[PDB]
Amino acid sequence: PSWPQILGRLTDNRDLARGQAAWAMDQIMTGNARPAQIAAFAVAMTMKAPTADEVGELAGVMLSHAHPLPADTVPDDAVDVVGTGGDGVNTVNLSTMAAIVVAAAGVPVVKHGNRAASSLSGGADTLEALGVRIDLGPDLVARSLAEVGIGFCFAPRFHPSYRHAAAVRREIGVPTVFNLLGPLTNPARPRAGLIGCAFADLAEVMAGVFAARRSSVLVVHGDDGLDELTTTTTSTIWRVAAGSVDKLTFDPAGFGFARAQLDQLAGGDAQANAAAVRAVLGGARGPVRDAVVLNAAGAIVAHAGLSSRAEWLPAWEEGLRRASAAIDTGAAEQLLARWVRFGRQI
Amino acid sequence: PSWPQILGRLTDNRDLARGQAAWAMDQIMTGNARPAQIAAFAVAMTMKAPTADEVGELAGVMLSHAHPLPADTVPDDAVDVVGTGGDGVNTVNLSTMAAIVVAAAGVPVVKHGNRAASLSGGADTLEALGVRIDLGPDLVARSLAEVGIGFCFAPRFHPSYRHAAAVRREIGVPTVFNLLGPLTNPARPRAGLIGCAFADLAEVMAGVFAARRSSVLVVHGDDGLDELTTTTTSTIWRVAAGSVDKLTFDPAGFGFARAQLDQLAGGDAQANAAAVRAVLGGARGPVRDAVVLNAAGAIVAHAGLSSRAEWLPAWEEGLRRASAAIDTGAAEQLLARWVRFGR
Ligand SMILES: O=P(O)(O)OC[C@H]1O[C@H](OP(=O)(O)OP(=O)(O)O)[C@H](O)[C@@H]1O
Ligand SMILES: O=P(O)(O)OC[C@H]1O[C@H](OP(=O)(O)OP(=O)(O)O)[C@H](O)[C@@H]1O
Ligand SMILES: O=C(O)c1ccccc1Nc1ccccc1C(=O)O
Ligand SMILES: O=C(O)c1ccccc1Nc1ccccc1C(=O)O
Ligand SMILES: O=C(O)c1ccccc1Nc1ccccc1C(=O)O
Ligand SMILES: O=C(O)c1ccccc1Nc1ccccc1C(=O)O
Ligand SMILES: [Mg+2]
Ligand SMILES: [Mg+2]
Ligand SMILES: [Mg+2]
């Protein structure tokens, strides 16, 4: 096991032997990997085309070093709403808005997230501008989830030993297999999720990883390129249920949604994006609401897949009903208020 | 241009635009590229499959930054005798020996190299023989004149390559950078016998030499050697007049026995050095056979600097000249004279 061996195999376009991807990530996280080695490995794996085995190994190492939540503190049916980012469109924070709404429908949510990478305001930037605490440690994220119905795991706080890899990722400024790893390494390990993938060529592999750990996940790619379920056109969904993956194309027109234009979903700085969260939770009708409800419903469909009695059309119809109701009743707006108060009450 | 633009293009499996490889390499050469960006570019260029245009851009930037030899110092017909390396097959430095013979035959040789990554490369073997390997430009120029051979130490002549060099060692896998050695001789000889281990990159290297109108034999032993092999046939890319000919070459057409890959082995600086003195001392057998044939090849490349050069008669002249330079003790005496020069 060594860098020349592993890098040599990748550059010869061969899949890694079992344990090699794991060995490599473990080196990255114990500080025994040079930035050049980290970059070479990220790039070579990408051009070879990563397998689910390899990417699962990498995320496995990461999770094996992540700060876990206290035992018996994350409900068996908790869901995440998170994406790779890197979609190149400056959007409002559809995942963070959908998460709030999903929690308010009564589904426990433990969202993994981070500050912006290639946009003006990431999930964490926006939650912060709203007055939500993005700085909580495990014991306090667990309390948030118990008391409020939602917790936020700020990726850097829970994965401090990934710091070198995250730096190299940003130094290279080209998407690689490493861009998959955030959504795959929520430290609370929820079993369900709506998982956005910006990179169409990698979403299948991502779904393979969720499939191996028997998650109930919808891996989503907007056909306009969004790492979210889009309203401008169709979305490609890799539906992961009972250890397998099937590829579906989803059309919001089937559920009465008008086509939107990308520029209608455009976001701004943290303050702009925060005001957009408030306008949606306050009942403002239009494109942004439609996209939040659609994404919230996809998370709820994922949640329902944990039972496997679940049927695709009734699921979506229930998801939409529940998501819209959570906004309409004020539950979602009140949930955000209660989330803010919780963090201020220490 | 930018790194995100260049790296994204390479990972989507596309050839670079004109001048992007030059841009990237100039960033690397001016201390402006982070190690991660160097490594990213090196790997992605390698897995995309580099073109002759791209590799020419890279080599060009290196030569722009290289310490040159003084003007009117390098004869028009100087040759190089060199390989990419990366062979894995730890053999005696056939290049270094062939080069001494070529010089002793009266063809000016200006060579170029670093110490081995592994166990004794061009530079190492030469040091064990007593040659001063890291003379500066003026002294390499005087060596070339007075001795008929000189050696340009890569860290001495390409010292802005240090950032790329660090990354090559950390990565420890062959990349496109492994190709640049034969392509970045700071004395810029126009002729050469150029060994390439990688079979799929030999033709690219040849394309680069064709662009600069070099009279070069880029050689690949159908047995994986980065020199003309006696084990089997060889693939030669004959570069002259700016065009390439891929032909297949058999030494037995000139009367060479076959050999075993094992008979060429040797690792220690002192083991390769002793094997130099032995062949130059007239020891017959497979090592000399390989030295002579590679020396002849470099002589054939030299001859191709004249348009009216015929393949078979040129090779006959080359072998005869190479054999004679050893047999008369001319090669042995040049090496002793070389050793003595650096004093
Ligand atoms: O800056 P980018 O690389 O283009 O990615 C946008 C964001 O992707 C993640 O989104 P997440 O799904 O976690 O939250 P969101 O959709 O609510 O922003 C995280 O916020 C990234 O910063
Ligand atoms: O560890 P390696 O990468 O294999 O290095 C062996 C040498 O290959 C080249 O040698 P050159 O052709 O200049 O001389 P030689 O073939 O006689 O050894 C290059 O200068 C390397 O130092
Ligand atoms: O950014 C990522 O690729 C990432 C992916 C998964 C987990 C954490 C991640 N980021 C970090 C981790 C530790 C310190 C800083 C960061 C950072 O984002 O700057
Ligand atoms: O030799 C010089 O004075 C010199 C001048 C400028 C740049 C490099 C130089 N030499 C080296 C540098 C690094 C390692 C070995 C050497 C060497 O000469 O063996
Ligand atoms: O390290 C090498 O083998 C090397 C190879 C080619 C060019 C430069 C090189 N290194 C240097 C040369 C002069 C000064 C400093 C360095 C350095 O390593 O920082
Ligand atoms: O890649 C080779 O070993 C090589 C092969 C043939 C001639 C020279 C070579 N080396 C270099 C050339 C230019 C700059 C740095 C180097 C270096 O090795 O550090
Ligand atoms: Mg998102
Ligand atoms: Mg997004
Ligand atoms: Mg050689």
Read off the tokens for A85: 């980012």
Q: Which helix H or strand E contains A220, and what residues bound it? A: strand A216-222
The three-class DSSP label of residue A292 is helix
Closest CA to B149 of B186, B99, B190: B99
Query: Is the CB of residue B242 below 6 angstroms from any atom belonging to ligand 4?
Result: no
CA distance A116 to A124: 8
CA distance B140 to B74: 10
Q: How far is CA A47 from the centre of its chain?
A: 23
Picking from B35, B46, B47, the nearest residue to A36 by CB comes out as B35
CATH of domain A75-346: 3.40.1030.10
Closest CA to A297 of A229, A223, A200: A229
Give the number of other Cβ atoms within 10 Å of residue B200's Cβ.
9
HSE on the CB side for A109, CA within 13 Å? 31
Name the minimum distance, in Å, from the CA of B86 to any CA of chain A. Answer: 12
Residues 6 or more apart whose CB falls under 8 angstroms from that of B241 comprise B213, B307
- Pocket test residue of B114, B134, B139, B152 for ligand 4, highest count of atoms within 8 A of CB: B134
Closest CA to B36 of A86, A40, A30, A28: A40
CA distance B189 to B187: 6
Chain A hits for B47, CB-CB cut-off 8 Å, are 11, 13, 43-44, 47-48
Q: Is domain A1-66 classified as CATH 1.10.1040.10?
A: no
Name the minimum distance, in Å, from the CA of A154 to any CA of chain B. Answer: 25
Query: Which residues lie across from B44 on neighbouring strands?
Result: none
CB A134 within 8 A of CB A121: no
Closest CA to B81 of B318, B281, B342: B318
Q: Counting every residue, how long is chain B?
A: 343
Read off the tokens for A80: 């995440």
Torsion angle, CA of A165/A167/A172/A176, rounded to 10 degrees?
40
Read off the tokens for B71: 């003007």
- Domain segments of chain A as ranges: 1-66, 75-346
Residues 6 or more apart whose CB falls under 8 angstroms from that of B306 comprise none
Protein residues whose CB sits closer than 6 Å to any atom of ligand 3: A 114, 155-156, 159-160, 162-163, 166, 169, 178, 181-182, 185
Q: Which of B14, B28, B46, B47 to mutate to test the interface with A (most CBs of A within 10 A)?
A: B47
Q: What separation in angstroms does the CA of B11 have from each of A211, A279, B336?
A: 27, 40, 51
CB B304 within 8 A of CB B314: yes
Flag whether B115 is marked binding.
Answer: yes
Q: Which atom of ligand 2 is nearest to the CA of B117?
A: 1
Sheet bearing A79-83, strands edge to edge = A150-154, A109-113, A79-83, A192-196, A216-222, A235-241, A244-250
Resolved by: X-ray
Closest CA to A62 of A157, A187, A169: A187
Flag whether B67 is marked binding.
Answer: no
What's the maximum distance between 2 C-alpha atoms anywhere in chain B? Answer: 60
Name the minimum distance, in Å, from the CA of A40 to any CA of chain B. Answer: 5
Read off the tokens for A13: 């376009």
Read off the tokens for B279: 């062949």
Closest CA to B205 of B186, B232, B177, B167: B177
DSSP assignments along A105-171, one per residue = TT--EEEEE-S-SSSS--HHHHHHHTT------HHHHHHHHHHHSEEEEEHHHH-GGGHHHHHHHHH
Query: Is the CB of residue B113 below 6 angstroms from any atom belonging to ligand 2?
Result: yes
**Would you call A172 and B36 a contact, using CB atoms and an 8 Å cutoff?**
yes
**Would you call A3 and B172 a contact, using CB atoms and an 8 Å cutoff?**
yes
Chain A hits for B13, CB-CB cut-off 8 Å, are 47
Domains A1-66 and A75-346 share a fold: no
CB B100 within 8 A of CB B280: yes
Q: Looking at the domain B75-343, which fold is it?
A: Pyrimidine Nucleoside Phosphorylase; Chain A, domain 2 (3.40.1030)
CB A14 within 8 A of CB A50: no
CA distance A301 to A108: 14
The three-class DSSP label of residue A175 is coil
Give the number of other Cβ atoms within 10 Å of residue B156's Cβ.
17
Q: Which helix H or strand E contains B275, and what residues bound it? A: helix B269-280
Torsion angle, CA of A17/A22/A23/A29, rounded to 10 degrees?
160
Q: What separation in angstroms does the CA of B279 have from each of A313, B99, B101, B148, B326?
A: 83, 13, 10, 20, 8
HSE on the CB side for A85, CA within 13 Å? 24
Residue B267, class by beta-carbon neighbours within 10 Å (0-12 exposed, 13-18 middle, 19+ buried)? middle
